[PDB]
Amino acid sequence: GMSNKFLGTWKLVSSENFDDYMKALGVGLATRKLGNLAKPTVIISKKGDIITIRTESTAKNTEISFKLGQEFEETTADNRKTKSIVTLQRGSLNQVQRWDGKETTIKRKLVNGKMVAECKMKGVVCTRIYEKV
Ligand SMILES: CCCCCCCCCCCCCCCC(=O)O
- Alpha carbons 133 and 124: distance in angstroms, whole number: 29
CATH class of 1-133: mainly beta
Q: Whose Cα sits closest to atom 1 in ligand 1?
A: 60
Rg (CA), the chain: 14
Q: Give the SS3 label for residue 120.
A: strand
Question: 10 C-alpha vs ligand 1 centroid, how far in Å?
Answer: 14
Q: Give the SS3 label for residue 109.
A: strand
* DSSP state string for 9-46: EEEEEEEESHHHHHHHHT--HHHHHHHHH---EEEEEE
CA distances 65 to 15, 29, 70, 123, Å, are: 24, 29, 11, 27
Q: Whose Cα sits closest to atom 3 in ligand 1?
A: 35
How remote is the C-alpha of 24 from its chain's centroid? 15
Helices and strands, number each (H, E), in the chain = 2, 10
Side chain identity, residue 37: L
Question: 77 C-alpha vs ligand 1 centroid, how far in Å?
Answer: 6
Which atom of ligand 1 lies nearest, measured to the CA of 25? 10
Question: 62 C-alpha vs ligand 1 centroid, how far in Å?
Answer: 9
Q: For the stretch 96-117, what's the b/e string if a residue is b when 16 or more beta carbons lie within 10 angstroms of its beta carbon?
A: bbebeeeebebbbbbeeeebbb
Q: Which residues contact 112 (CB under 8 A, 6 or more apart)?
A: none
Question: 74 C-alpha vs ligand 1 centroid, how far in Å?
Answer: 13
Kindly report each contact of residues 112-115 with a partner whose C-beta sits within 8 Å and lies 24 or more positions away, as own/partner: 114/13, 115/6, 115/10, 115/42
Parse the chain into domains and list their residue ranges: 1-133
Contact 84, 69 (CB under 8 A): no
Q: Half-sphere exposure of residue 29, counting CA atoms within 13 Å on the CB side? A: 0
CB of 80 within 6 A of ligand 1: the answer is: no
Angle subtended by helix axes 18-25 and 29-37, to nearest 10: 150
